[PDB]
């Protein structure tokens, strides 16, 4: 994986360049937002379970999805689905701390679209589950962090569609 800082280092390493003014400006733009990323992660982590619960309630359950014939019918599959939800939340929190989406590609999106096609897992319904968790997250983390958390949920959801 890479973060903001190693994204820059590797981009310069392939050119064998010492870090110059443009590079140093990018890294500053990361460091200057760093404390806010940390606070936001502590809110998400400590509200993890409630975010999933409120996101499922707005976007998944009370529906045909949870009824016989639906993909989140059976305690087995309901458990698998909210298990997935926890992955998304947790990794988006990593991406936002790192200030780089590369981890969402390497460890979450790669092959996932076809995995879901192969099992029958409804893609559009999963995206709504992602964009509902974003909605909840953006309330809990506040002005400071709302836009920055949000983008990696949006990265996740356009990665499936």
């Amino acid at each position: 994986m890479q973060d903001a800082i190693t994204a820059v280092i590797n981009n310069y390493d392939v050119q064998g360049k010492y870090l110059d003014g443009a590079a140093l400006d990018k890294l500053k733009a990361y460091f200057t937002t760093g404390a806010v990323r940390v606070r936001a992660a502590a809110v998400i982590s400590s509200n993890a379970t409630t975010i999933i619960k409120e996101a499922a309630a707005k976007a998944l359950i009370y529906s045909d999805l949870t009824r016989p014939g639906g993909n989140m019918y059976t305690t087995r599959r309901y458990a698998a689905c909210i298990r997935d939800m926890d992955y998304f939340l947790r990794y988006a929190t990593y991406a936002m701390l790192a200030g780089d989406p590369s981890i969402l590609d390497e460890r979450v999106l790669n092959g996932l679209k076809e995995t879901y096609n192969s099992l029958g897992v409804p893609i559009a319904a999963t995206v709504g589950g992602i964009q509902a968790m974003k909605e909840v997250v953006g309330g809990l983390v506040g002005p400071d962090a709302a836009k920055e958390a949000s983008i990696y949920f949006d990265y996740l959801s356009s990665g499936l569609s």
């Binding site: 800082i5 280092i9 890294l27 990361y30 982590s45 990593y94 701390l97 790192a98």
Partner: protein, 160 residues
């Protein structure tokens, strides 16, 4: 980075970051501007550091620039300073990342095998790095010189 290291440990244990892990990200990022200044100063004096490192090296080990020496000759010496320029660059990367991930993948993992093939005496490369520490460290405030010094001593350590 500090970020990459913290996260990789988090993901591998299937969990959110610890209070500890969060704290170090916070302390690290607070030192951002300072770390960037340390890299700038050293980037700004790279040619001096390399050249003066190269003199300090050949006094301490004249055998490498002698008949049966790996760096014997004008262009066997030119490549030798170029390698010293490489490692100073990696040291600036490490300082701004706050750990060695980048330094390691780029220039220590595989370095024994590379230099053994070329028949380069590894421990005299470690000396060239100590020599760079001495020069670079004389262009930095006490506090910044120590922070830089850890990364120089790491490279010296890894060639071992």
């Amino acid at each position: 980075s500090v970020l990459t290291k913290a996260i990789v440990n988090a993901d591998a244990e299937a969990r959110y970051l610890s209070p500890g892990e969060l704290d170090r990200i916070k302390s690290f990022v607070a030192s951002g501007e300072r770390r960037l200044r340390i890299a700038q100063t050293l980037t700004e004096a790279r040619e001096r550091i390399v050249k003066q490192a190269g003199d300090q090296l050949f006094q301490i080990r004249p055998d490498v620039v002698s008949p049966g020496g790996n760096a014997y000759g004008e262009k066997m010496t030119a490549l030798c300073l170029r390698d010293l320029d490489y490692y100073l660059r990696l040291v600036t990367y490490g300082i701004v990342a706050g750990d060695v991930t980048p330094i390691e993948e780029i220039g220590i993992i595989g370095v024994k095998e590379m230099y053994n093939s070329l028949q380069t005496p590894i421990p005299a490369v470690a000396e060239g790095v100590r020599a760079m520490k001495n020069v670079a460290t004389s262009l930095l405030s006490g506090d910044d010189a120590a922070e830089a010094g850890f990364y120089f001593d790491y490279l010296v350590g890894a060639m071992q």
